[PDB]
């Protein structure tokens, strides 16, 4: 489906509704029908929903790189002048919500509408037709939402123990519906280690043979140890699917959705992913992921590490000041000293960040970001290149957390611009190549 601005829908379908409201007696002749639509008299809206029903439309975003840059959807009348785009098709369209626009096209002939529903429909195109990897697979928010859902926290609230001597196990639940009643009260944590009896889900392979092997668990009851979230996660997958019981990185999510395409019809994958979306969002907001100057941490070893290589630099620079050193070698040496230190601060930085910090969780889960990126935010941005394409031996010791300096900043843009210029000519040439490949 897609959100279609009702004003836009009205004009697009104008000849269709003009007929419809002449069929119903709203208007006596075609001339009256045309004025009725132009002035937007309120009768037309109910009529529009009629003609638009199950009548598909093509959505395109420029530039169109692969055929997936055009897809058919089911139009839904929407208030406002914007277009509502399903969040799972951004990948294919490369659609930023920074203010991108998209074109709508109305297929007319029976054949054109058939091609839209069958060939180009959104839910029938999931995997990229290049690598076969899944595209509509969750990303960004939806990653961290599920990654949080499935993660396991040592010593969370309600953790199964299991009890000894005077008490029974204490981490057990009659059903999943019970662990919910326990979660809503402060008793249970979604990330807790508890074990539960499950009638309506399917155990894994190995534990399936040992438990049943008759056999199966269509309505049957069985017990495994998982986080309550991991249970709810597996309620999103098809009932016929085995119980995964992992914390879901992006790659782990790619593994599964890749697997659903091999073992299941497309409609199943279409709906499974829709459920991953709804869940991932709900838990991305409940995830407690934000950013603050506080949540940006800096390693304390950075100072000593910094001055450790400052001496090695001024000493190797002292060897060049002595006259014996080869000028190209001293500068070259400063690259290797500083380039190396950049890793130690990276090693030191990674070591400092608690695993639940909001900044690192984003990168860990594979939702978005890099470590190289989080190395310039805190710690050091590192060495930068001159416009000549060489490496300026002067490092940027500050990080964008502490702020750069007048000269640190003037140097960065030296290179940072040359990169933004490249991105300009990289699309001009890449498109010139694609046009030759196509021809």
């Amino acid at each position: 489906q897609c959100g279609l601005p009702k004003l836009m829908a009205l004009e697009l379908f104008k000849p269709f509704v003009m007929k419809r409201l002449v069929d119903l007696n709203h208007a006596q002749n075609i001339k009256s029908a045309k004025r009725m639509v132009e002035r937007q008299r309120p009768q037309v809206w109910d009529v529009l929903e009629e003609v638009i029903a199950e009548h598909p439309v093509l959505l395109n975003r420029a530039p169109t790189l692969h055929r997936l840059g055009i897809q058919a959807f089911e139009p839904q009348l929407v208030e406002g002048k914007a277009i509502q785009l399903h969040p799972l098709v951004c990948e294919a369209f490369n659609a930023d919500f920074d203010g991108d626009q998209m074109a709508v096209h109305l297929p007319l002939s029976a054949e054109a509408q058939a091609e839209a529903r069958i060939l180009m429909l959104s839910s029938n195109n999931i995997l990229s037709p290049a690598s076969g990897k899944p595209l509509a697979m969750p990303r960004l928010d939806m990653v961290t939402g599920l990654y949080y859902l499935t993660t396991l926290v040592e010593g969370a609230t309600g953790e199964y123990q299991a009890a000894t001597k005077d008490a029974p196990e204490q981490g057990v639940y009659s059903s999943p519906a019970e662990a919910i009643m326990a979660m809503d009260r402060g008793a249970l944590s979604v990330r807790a280690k508890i074990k539960v009896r499950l009638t309506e889900l399917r155990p894994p392979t190995d534990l399936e043979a040992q438990l049943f092997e008759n056999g199966w668990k269509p309505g049957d009851a069985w017990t495994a140890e998982t986080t309550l979230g991991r249970v709810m996660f597996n309620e999103l997958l098809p009932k016929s699917y085995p119980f995964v019981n992992e914390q879901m990185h992006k790659k782990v999510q790619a593994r599964i959705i890749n697997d659903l395409a091999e073992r299941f019809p497309m409609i199943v994958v279409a709906q499974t992913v829709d459920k991953l979306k709804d869940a991932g969002f709900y838990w991305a907001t409940r995830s407690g992921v934000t950013v603050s100057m506080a949540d940006v941490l800096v390693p304390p070893q950075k100072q000593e590490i910094l001055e450790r290589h400052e001496a090695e630099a001024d000493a190797i620079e002292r060897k060049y000041q002595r006259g014996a050193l080869n000028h190209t070698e001293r500068n070259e040496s400063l690259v290797k000293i500083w380039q190396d230190a950049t890793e130690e601060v990276g090693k030191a930085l990674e070591e400092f960040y608690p695993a639940d910090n909001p900044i690192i969780t984003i990168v860990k889960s594979g939702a978005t970001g890099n470590l190289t990126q989080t190395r310039t935010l805190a710690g050091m941005k590192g060495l930068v290149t001159n416009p000549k394409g060489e490496f300026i031996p002067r490092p940027i010791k500050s990080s964008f957390r502490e702020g750069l300096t007048v000269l640190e900043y003037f140097i960065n843009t030296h290179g940072a611009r040359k990169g933004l210029a490249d991105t300009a000519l990289r699309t001009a040439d890449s498109g010139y190549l694609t046009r030759r490949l196509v021809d």
Binding site: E115, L119, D439
Partner: protein, 63 residues
Amino acid sequence: WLSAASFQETTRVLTDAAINCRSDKLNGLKENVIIGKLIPAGTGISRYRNIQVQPTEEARAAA
């Protein structure tokens, strides 16, 4: 020849085509796009576009 002309070096192409007195069969899909024909790929291939559909006599009975 009109596929080559639309691609690049249009003048070079048209001049060599007019001297060689070139005849274009209009088989390729770019040619069919230009003239508005059905590209010979996907649903435009002969085997698909010539499909004939009728309801089964069994189906017409049930009406």
